[PDB]
Design an enzyme around this catalytic site. Structure first.
Site, PDB file in Angstrom:
ATOM      1  N   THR A  57     -10.231 -13.115  -9.387  1.00 58.26           N
ATOM      2  CA  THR A  57      -9.491 -12.964 -10.634  1.00 58.26           C
ATOM      3  C   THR A  57      -9.708 -11.609 -11.300  1.00 58.26           C
ATOM      4  OG1 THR A  57     -11.293 -14.173 -11.703  1.00 58.26           O
ATOM      5  CG2 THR A  57      -9.300 -15.425 -11.152  1.00 58.26           C
TER       6      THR A  57
ATOM      7  N   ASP B 107       6.174  -4.385  15.010  1.00 57.66           N
ATOM      8  CA  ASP B 107       5.629  -3.065  14.698  1.00 57.66           C
ATOM      9  C   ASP B 107       5.547  -2.178  15.929  1.00 57.66           C
ATOM     10  OD1 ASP B 107       3.787  -1.018  13.356  1.00 57.66           O
ATOM     11  OD2 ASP B 107       4.014  -2.479  11.736  1.00 57.66           O
TER      12      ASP B 107
ATOM     13  N   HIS C 137      -0.384   2.175  13.891  1.00 59.74           N
ATOM     14  CA  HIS C 137       0.137   1.484  12.717  1.00 59.74           C
ATOM     15  C   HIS C 137       0.152  -0.031  12.917  1.00 59.74           C
ATOM     16  CE1 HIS C 137       3.487   0.166  10.031  1.00 59.74           C
ATOM     17  NE2 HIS C 137       3.004   1.077   9.207  1.00 59.74           N
TER      18      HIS C 137
ATOM     19  N   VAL D 110      13.583 -13.427   1.948  1.00 60.62           N
ATOM     20  CA  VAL D 110      12.280 -13.143   2.526  1.00 60.62           C
ATOM     21  C   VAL D 110      11.327 -12.694   1.422  1.00 60.62           C
ATOM     22  CG1 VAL D 110      13.305 -12.627   4.785  1.00 60.62           C
ATOM     23  CG2 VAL D 110      12.810 -10.760   3.156  1.00 60.62           C
TER      24      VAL D 110
ATOM     25  N   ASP E 210       8.885  -9.713  -4.587  1.00 59.82           N
ATOM     26  CA  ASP E 210       8.346 -11.033  -4.883  1.00 59.82           C
ATOM     27  C   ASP E 210       6.876 -11.013  -5.279  1.00 59.82           C
ATOM     28  OD1 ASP E 210      10.684 -12.783  -4.063  1.00 59.82           O
ATOM     29  OD2 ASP E 210      10.399 -11.549  -2.269  1.00 59.82           O
TER      30      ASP E 210
ATOM     31  N   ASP F 168      -1.621  -8.496 -14.435  1.00 65.24           N
ATOM     32  CA  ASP F 168      -2.837  -7.701 -14.331  1.00 65.24           C
ATOM     33  C   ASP F 168      -2.623  -6.292 -13.786  1.00 65.24           C
ATOM     34  OD1 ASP F 168      -4.442  -9.763 -15.397  1.00 65.24           O
ATOM     35  OD2 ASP F 168      -4.548 -10.744 -13.441  1.00 65.24           O
TER      36      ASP F 168
END
Length: 279
Positions: free
Chosen positions: A16, A39, A69, A177, A200, A260
């Site tokens: 938190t 990827d 990557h 998505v 999102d 936050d």
């Protein structure tokens, strides 16, 4: 379970508060789930993957990761030290060449591949796909991501690194998505992270330590690094039975740390991925 001296992003997703360094998680650790990393490939021989990673598809002369990557992203999903879901099975799909580039037609084929290939794998707790890639807006790319999600795969995609509205990038702009922005260790929006209503969730994306090719490790930054935190978190939560592939993005948003992050533009969610694990 507690992993001391963990990478900051792992500690962040189980906390938190910023500024701690221990990662806390349920010992089930994503066992019985599967995550596809779409990827540059995965160096499956890396000791950090413990035999749980494998290449399943390439569109190029090798399935090896000649870039790093994809190996880094896979490490954040599921490596023993650097991963969120330390017991998940990792499947590599090499749609990007060793320079990190790929044609949209190849990327689309790779997404449709995963939608079918999951039926050839044992993933009783569910299936996730992590897409740390993107380019300019394409309805065909977005539709492929939507199909993959519809087929029963939790799709997590990078928002992009343009410090711009992600509505103009694909597959970031596909509504169905999970589009992932990046934050830093001080709970600031990463300087490069895209933003916008299509995001999102945010995950750790600045200065992320993970696996690299040649059996090595390194710290790099990007929404490419935030995405696998969310993909691994989804696999972990699905193994716990708390959510499903179709509902995991919404569940992660429901249970996120809220309000936050700093420098979140008006109209972009202020939500940071959080596992809500109580030790």
């Amino acid at each position: 379970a507690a992993q001391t001296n963990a990478p900051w992003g792992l500690a962040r997703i189980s906390s938190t508060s910023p500024g701690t360094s221990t990662y806390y998680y349920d010992e089930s650790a994503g066992q019985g789930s599967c995550v596809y990393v779409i990827d540059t490939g995965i160096e499956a021989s890396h000791p950090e993957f413990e035999g749980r990673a494998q290449m399943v598809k390439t569109y190029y002369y090798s399935s090896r990761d000649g870039n790093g990557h994809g190996t880094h992203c896979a490490g954040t999903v599921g490596s023993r030290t650097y991963g969120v879901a330390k017991k998940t099975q990792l499947f590599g799909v090499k749609v990007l060449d060793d320079n990190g580039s790929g044609q949209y037609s190849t990327i689309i084929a790779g997404m449709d591949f995963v939608a079918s290939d999951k039926n050839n794998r044992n993933c009783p707790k569910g299936v996730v796909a992590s897409l740390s890639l993107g380019g300019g807006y394409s309805s065909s790319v977005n539709s492929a991501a939507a199909r993959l999600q519809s087929s029963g795969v939790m799709v997590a995609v990078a928002a992009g690194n343009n410090n711009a509205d992600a509505r103009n990038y694909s597959p970031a702009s596909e509504p169905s998505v999970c589009t992932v922005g990046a934050s830093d260790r001080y709970d600031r929006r990463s300087s490069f992270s895209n933003y916008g209503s299509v995001l999102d969730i945010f995950g750790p994306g600045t200065d992320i330590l993970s696996t690299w090719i040649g059996g090595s490790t390194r710290s790099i930054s990007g929404t490419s690094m935030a995405t696998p935190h969310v993909a691994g978190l989804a696999a972990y939560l699905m193994t716990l039975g708390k959510t499903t592939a179709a509902s995991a993005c919404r569940y992660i948003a429901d249970t996120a740390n809220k309000g936050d992050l700093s420098n979140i533009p008006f109209g972009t969610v202020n939500l940071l991925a959080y596992n809500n694990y109580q030790a």
